[PDB]
Amino acid sequence: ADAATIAKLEEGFKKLEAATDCKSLLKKYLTKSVFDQLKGKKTSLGATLLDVIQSGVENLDSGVGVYAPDAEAYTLFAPLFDPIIEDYHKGFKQTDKHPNKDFGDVNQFVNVDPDGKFVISTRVRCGRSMEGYPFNPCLTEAQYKEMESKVSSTLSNLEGELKGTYYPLTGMTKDVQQKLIDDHFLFKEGDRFLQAANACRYWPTGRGIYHNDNKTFLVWCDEEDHLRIISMQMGGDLGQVYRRLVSAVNEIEKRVPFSHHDRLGFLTFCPTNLGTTVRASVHIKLPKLAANREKLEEVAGKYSLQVRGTRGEHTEAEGGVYDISNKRRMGLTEFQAVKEMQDGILELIKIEKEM
Fold this sequence. Notes:
Blueprint: H1 3-17, H2 25-29, H3 32-38, H4 50-58, H5 73-76, H6 78-88, E1 119-128, H7 141-156, E2 164-168, H8 174-182, H9 192-196, E3 208-212, E4 217-221, E5 227-234, H10 238-255, E6 260-261, E7 265-266, E8 279-285, H11 287-291, H12 293-302, E9 305-309, E10 321-326, H13 334-353
Antiparallel strand pairs: 1-5, 1-8, 2-3, 3-4, 4-5, 6-7, 8-10, 9-10
Helix pairs in contact: 1-4
PDB class: allergen
Keywords: Food allergy, sea food allergy
Assembly: monomeric
């Protein structure tokens, strides 16, 4: 690590002490003892501590404030990453190992609302970093093109349910944009937190969108992580959504190896998405539980569920509509995470019926 970067690191640290208002996990765990042991180190691909914390220094309001420049950095800079991970993922000690991938007995997953009267739509997401490339902080332009032609080639040779079409962002027509905007499939350049992390360079080179013909499978190449992989549909057939996801992820891995770490799970750009990288969610109507919020907050904790209200434009009538997702991503398998989610929704609907 060169003297010019070490100087810029010394600036950011004094800027963190000078921000007594900052509540970011970066400021919490970047002690002077850790900072002096990491500031001079660099990965074998060339990423410095500055490529980790720059975005958290430029954005003092940021919640986490660190990002991973390459896969190797989670090891080289573990003295800062490990305590941050402990904090965000409550109960993931610095010595615990995350289980290896296990999609489990996928047949055990069912429809959580067979009569469609409660769940509007069902969604399961995961992400992957492609093995052999650095993450978005350090991707060169040539690397962006190589990834695009590989993901495009891979996703285009998908057959059956996943038969689709890849739309690259570079030189996208105005017509496709609307058609993709219409289907909620498009993404744009990242917010202020990604821009400060160097995560939005050479835009839109290397960025693309893939969706199947049935519009129940959707992949984003290089929006934030290398790959974001979603299975979605209307209704509450969590099982069907989840089984379609495992089919796709296994099939992509045949041609595309993923960046895995036998203690942190699947490696991603942001430490909030380590472990399973799995976020199973439903849009569900629970009007009775909306009145008695204390019961909903209590049952949500029983199944480790995050309850967010729907972001919306004209939603004043829909206060009893929720986006319920699974909160846990580490220290448990993919199968365990989605099962826990399913068990939750089943009980939430059961309670709603008893009101």
